[PDB]
Design a protein around this ligand. Structure first.
Ligand SMILES: *Cc1c(COP(=O)(O)O)cnc(C)c1O
Ligand SMILES: *Cc1c(COP(=O)(O)O)cnc(C)c1O
Lengths: 823, 823
């Protein structure tokens, strides 16, 4: 609240219902009400957005361009209000108008533009870059369809189109006026001055901008996402008859480029359509960059010629994964072919400008494009690429004289009866810095897959542990919590998570301990109920909520959790009159369509729940639930409500993880392996304050050396063995005896993740979990140790690191002056 | 002007530049300026729009639904201001802000949703229906692409996509909340209660509303145009795998329905796509209608059951041409199949509700659908249709006992080795009224093509001469003129064109005569200049501007005009030192892609200009110009600037014409045949006050009886004969001797329009034109007689007639009370 402001907001809300929506109070739906509030908050954002940009114009700082094919933003309304601090007023304002804001918020559809970790990261970054006063821009694609809505039918995932712009998107701003052409196909003509790319087919890239407000600093940066539009004539040009009408219809072909996001996480699919997406983002983006460089305070900058030598002094391009790797030869192409810079000079520039982040070591996720694909779609780019390789291999050669295998190993070109380009090698070669996202990940990169690279240029490899935004991930989703903490230490911690440590002072503090546990129960009650309203639940609120939410994958080992769960059901069924800690096990996440195994997995979960939830001997005791359509908005409701976070990837598979960090801040204890960021988390909180288990990296490696035999486990562990037979015999699929005989085969003959090898220790560590939960006060003190020690995981420390060690910029906590415009 | 209002407008303009466009005065383009003004005017329109609708709700009048596949609206900004009377203020407001409004207006793209006459008519209607206080709604399709932009290249028409929504459309309002399903394909199952339409494929119809403000009466009606959207699941449903991604892409198929307008004028093309368009408009529309009937003050209307007997008392559906003819069986379908009404009862209803307007007698324009097309796409509709026929032919049978040919002649089903449905017969059978658009047209309908029908039910046939809106067509495009007239008789004539007659008093009135001729010259100067700016002109302002603007067609006889023009060039070239009235002959209009002849024609015009404009012996004297991309906005600039309107269709081909009427009001003298509305125009103004010529209907018929032989003309007229040889010999196509040997063939062996048969009289009447022009004062007095006598041609008289003799409603001149909302 605060009366004038409240007077204002009520006024504007009324103005947009009428004017903007063209609706009357006798006809508006909560949906209209939603949109009316959105447009009121949005106004509060314009002057600042305009000012920020104006500011960068004449202030001309180095700019950071964050290129990503994914921006997994979720809802924007709550988050803009938090950031603008309008939350209470909006609340009052809507109270008096009589509306239930929280009810309005649920009407907002998520902006589901990514698949999971990589895209959520990009979204946290932007908020961190904005909160830190950097002149940064996120560039992506405006997909008409984000990641699909996941439906569960008869136990199976059914995918339906995420029609996110149906009702409109109040936060973006079409910028048809800044549409630029993108070229595809054609042929090259090396002639006189040099090479020309001709008889190409053109697609227009049209930008849409979305504001990204920093935490109460009067800063609003931009997220520019391109939309594909077909040119107006070929699409009726050429000698080009064949139907006037059909030619008009044929525009689809072309606009198809930004139609939908490829729904694969940590999986590479060599489809032309994806490659066009990657080229399109990059080509349009680079023009914008160049445009901005040349027109800026250089706007004048008369005579070198037009200088690029200063390029790296004013621009940084960050490659989120190899997705946008084409930015490398695209920058060379332009500099060279269009700007007429000598290779040497341009390469230098490129290097100093580009930086690449690796997100995984899984071989199947790596991008290796068939050259036949490139040759065709981007002939000039393959030429450039061959060129880089040459020059690149001439450098190794010199360094490791005679080392003939190394040459073959580091080549960007994989000759092999399907000659491919390794996108990762192109990226290291063309960038001044390469970082892993977790120190362990970073260490393994340099010890293995990129060993050769490191040896050639140690100086290029860095580490930048990932983070999460305390705004969305604490303040927005768990206000009870932020509150109880604020009471104690106040608020400077929302933009300085580190101060959470002063929290160690209340571990032994009883009013504290009761608050912490109390907010935790409330969250729980709010989740249980939501469960019911929105579906059919009847979940046990005074049960340990054990949640595993992330994309479904073999490496994630939702299966091991599945094993845990049947064991539990099995012990119970064996000695049912015995008291055990009640638990509500929740698992959710999406599987890419066609990742047969991921689909099999979900079904298996549903299968267990079908059995477990209908056993009268089980009672209150065990509940298994598959959480349908997990995405940003769902994560905001379930995370704050959980007690135990399952982060159990086979050590060395999960590069960092971030769901990781979200649970730590909302007070859940973590059960996990020493993989990714869990290593650092445990590190910061103390190993006694985490439920660690299983093999470490060296362990895995030592087993692989031996050769892994699941038969041995099966053979040596009765419990495990019985689960098998039950999976195998139709225990969980009556109708269809052999339904899961597939997971069995895999578990038994080809489990690349050695599920069985960490089973015994996992079940054992889980008992320890249960033991601690029976002692409330003790479970809460530990949790306190987790919350207290989470500040290192804010995306603000992360961004501060990138800024300083790669971008060469300085974050500011400084507030843009910026109210507005009156006269 | 008017100071407070001006203060307001300036304020709001400023508000939207900032807030709505998110632009600053250091960055806005005239385009932004345009959009900022549009959004300010639009606000002035909402309360009235909301109020109007609210008013109809509780006032519950009979509603009129005008169904059309075309709504050729043009620009909306000027027209909303005229209607809201904000024109001066906006002018001031923009003055002081320093902008040149007129310059801003040119930025608005036309809403090119129709092809010519039929669609422009629908647009005039809405304005008339609104000005007359009727509770009327226009229903159509929101095409993403209207009629194509016409480019002329090397003398030929090149068509490019009319990408009208590129930059957005400020006047519409998406209504995603009122999307309804439309069904296609399926099969029928006759069972128990009756027939069911199953296993159909569904497309969603999403409405977009546009306000239609009446002339200063505080009334704003709605234009609702549907957009095709694909359902969210099949488009990923069924067992329906085959690519998750490809399934997503496949949504195009479906949204393809509203992608573009078919660019044929007075031409029927039996393409499935068009039929889907026709079904889609109708199905979505009917639901809205039914919805409105049942929910309205019947909202209560408890027990008959739900009564339809009152249906015709609350609804009128007007079929613009047979395009929407499916409304007939669609209404039966619902009433019958869904509402479970006995056929008899429903038929009765249908009849009393539907009315159909015929727009042409040309056989090639008539819709005759292959039943194989229907059987498939709309199986239940073909069943219904067969049913109507039966019952229908059982009525003739009874009436004309034994008359076996009549039966065959009136059948809705044309058996004939491609069995087709005659859309026109279905329409007469199912409607209580059928009207022609010109009394002559109306008389010929009943004398010929529908002779049988008339004989069966004389009472169904009417006449409703077309009209034009004096708002767009006088006030908006020729303010000088409206002014000079206003000075004399004031303004009640904008909504009572009839008062234009009091104008007879100044014929012999010299200050009048000078005004009239003066505004005419100004208009001329403004056109000539526009010519130059926008292109390359150098047109003779003190020349008789002879214009023929309409769609290119054989029946229109742009060729005869072409003949006129070469003759002139020929006489000149023969006795060049002889004085003649200088003339600038302008011809423009679009040809449907693939109407080879129409394309040939344009080229021929360009061809003549290539020759004529570069003959030094011609000089100032003759100028031939092809006006590229003629459409609503162009008509508004050229009509007011013309001196002679060419309305020269072979008598009996042009049903009415309306370009007809536009020229009469902007003071042009008319050269024409006694065809369509020219008959009535000449009638009202006096035959001595028109340049009439050629054969009348009876004449044509008498020649056809003889058998038409162009050789006879060629043989008997030297002038004509020489033109031939020149066309034939390469006179106008050096490079390509035989280019036009095609038009020649046609002219000579197969001219269905008997161009040659009206050549002599045409050239003769033209001399008379020239004679009068040499006497300014006399040309102006005549013109005065034309303007004075034009009131009958306002769309207001037209709409008043429809209202009273078909809709059974009463127009009102009564002003909605309606300012707004304060507190
Ligand atoms: C944070 C987040 C992720 C990443 O979770 P991990 O457990 O690191 O894989 C995936 N999806 C959503 C919706 C998220 O919020
Ligand atoms: C009025 C009008 C027409 C109809 O002109 P006719 O001469 O009756 O065929 C066609 N096109 C446009 C743009 C119009 O304004």
């Amino acid at each position: 609240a605060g009366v004038e402001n409240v007077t204002e907001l009520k006024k504007n809300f009324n103005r947009h219902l009428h004017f903007t929506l063209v609706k009357d109070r006798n006809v508006a739906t909560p949906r209209d009400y939603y949109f009316a509030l959105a447009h009121t908050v949005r106004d509060h954002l314009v002057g600042r957005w305009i000012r920020t940009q104006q500011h960068y114009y004449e202030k001309d700082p180095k700019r950071i361009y964050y290129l990503s094919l994914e921006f997994y933003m979720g809802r924007t309304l709550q988050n803009t209000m938090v950031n603008l601090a309008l939350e209470n007023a909006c609340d009052e304002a809507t109270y008096q108008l009589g509306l239930d804001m929280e009810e309005l918020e649920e009407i907002e559809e998520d902006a589901g533009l990514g698949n999971g970790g990589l895209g959520r990261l990009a979204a946290c970054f932007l908020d961190s870059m904005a909160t830190l006063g950097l002149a940064a821009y996120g560039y992506g694609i405006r997909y008409e369809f984000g990641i699909f809505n996941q439906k569960i039918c008869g136990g199976w995932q059914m995918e339906e189109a995420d029609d996110w712009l149906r009702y409109g998107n109040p936060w973006e701003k079409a910028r048809p006026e800044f549409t630029l052409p993108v070229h595809f196909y054609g042929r090259v003509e090396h002639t006189s001055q040099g090479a020309k790319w001709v008889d190409t087919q053109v697609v227009l890239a049209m930008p849409y901008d979305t504001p990204v407000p920093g935490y109460r600093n009067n800063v609003v940066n931009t997220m520019r996402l391109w939309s594909a539009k077909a040119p107006n004539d070929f699409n009726l040009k050429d000698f080009n008859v064949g139907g006037y009408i059909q030619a008009v219809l044929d525009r689809n072909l072309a606009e198809n480029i930004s139609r939908v996001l490829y729904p694969n996480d940590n999986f590479f699919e060599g489809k032309e359509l994806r490659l066009k997406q990657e080229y399109f983002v990059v080509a349009a983006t680079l023009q914008d960059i160049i445009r901005r460089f040349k027109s800026s305070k250089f706007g004048c900058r008369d005579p070198v010629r037009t200088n690029f030598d200063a390029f790296p002094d004013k621009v940084a391009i960050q490659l989120n994964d190899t997705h946008p790797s084409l930015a490398i030869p695209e920058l060379m192409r332009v500099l060279v072919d269009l700007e007429r810079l000598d290779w040497d000079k341009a390469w230098e520039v490129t290097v100093k400008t580009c930086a690449y982040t690796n997100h995984t070591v899984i071989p199947e996720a790596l991008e290796r494009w068939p050259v036949h694909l490139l040759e065709t779609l981007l002939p000039r780019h393959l030429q450039i690429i061959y060129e880089i390789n040459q020059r690149f291999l001439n450098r190794v050669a010199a360094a490791f004289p005679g080392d003939v295998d190394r040459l073959r190993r580091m080549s960007l070109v994989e000759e092999g009866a399907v000659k491919r380009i390794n996108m990762a090698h192109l990226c290291i070669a063309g960038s001044h810095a390469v970082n892993g996202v977790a120190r362990i990940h970073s260490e393994i990169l340099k010890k293995t897959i990129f060993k050769d690279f490191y040896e050639l240029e140690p100086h290029k490899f860095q580490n930048k542990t990932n983070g999460i935004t305390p705004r969305r991930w604490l303040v927005l989703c768990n206000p009870g919590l932020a509150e109880i903490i604020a009471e104690r230490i106040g608020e400077e911690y929302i933009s300085d998570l580190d101060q959470l440590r002063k929290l160690l002072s209340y571990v032994d503090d009883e009013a504290f301990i009761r608050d912490v546990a109390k907010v935790k129960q409330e969250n729980k009650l709010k989740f249980a109920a939501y469960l019911e309203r929105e579906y059919k639940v009847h979940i046990n609120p005074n049960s340990l909520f054990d949640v595993q939410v992330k994309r479904i994958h073999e490496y994630k080992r939702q299966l091991l959790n599945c094993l845990h769960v049947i064991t539990l059901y099995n012990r119970i069924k064996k000695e049912p009159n015995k008291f055990v800690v009640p638990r509500t096990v929740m698992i959710g996440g999406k599987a890419a369509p066609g990742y047969h195994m991921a689909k099999m997995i979900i079904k298996l979960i549903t299968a267990i729940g079908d059995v477990v939830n209908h056993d009268p001997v089980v009672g209150d005791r065990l509940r298994v639930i598959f959480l349908e359509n997990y995405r940003v908005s769902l994560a905001e409701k379930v995370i704050p409500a959980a007690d135990l976070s399952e982060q159990i990837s086979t050590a060395g598979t999960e590069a960092s993880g971030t769901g990781n960090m979200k649970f730590m801040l909302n007070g859940a204890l973590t059960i996990g392996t020493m993989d990714g960021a869990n290593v650092e988390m445990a590190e910061e909180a103390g190993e006694e304050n985490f439920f660690i288990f299983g093999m470490r990296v060296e362990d895995v490696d030592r087993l692989d050396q031996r050769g892994y035999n699941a038969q041995e486990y099966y053979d040596r562990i009765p419990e495990l063995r019985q689960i098998i037979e039950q999976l195998s015999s139709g225990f969980f699929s009556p109708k269809q005896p052999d339904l899961f005989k597939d997971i069995v085969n895999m578990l038994m003959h080809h489990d690349r993740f050695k599920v069985f090898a960490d089973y015994e220790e996992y079940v054992k560590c889980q008992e320890r979990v249960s033991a601690l939960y029976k002692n409330p006060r003790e479970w809460t003190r530990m949790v306190i140790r987790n919350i207290a020690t989470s500040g290192k995981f804010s995306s603000d420390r992360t961004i501060a690191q990138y800024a300083r060690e790669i971008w060469g910029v300085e974050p500011s906590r400084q507030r843009l002056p910026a109210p507005d415009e009156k006269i």
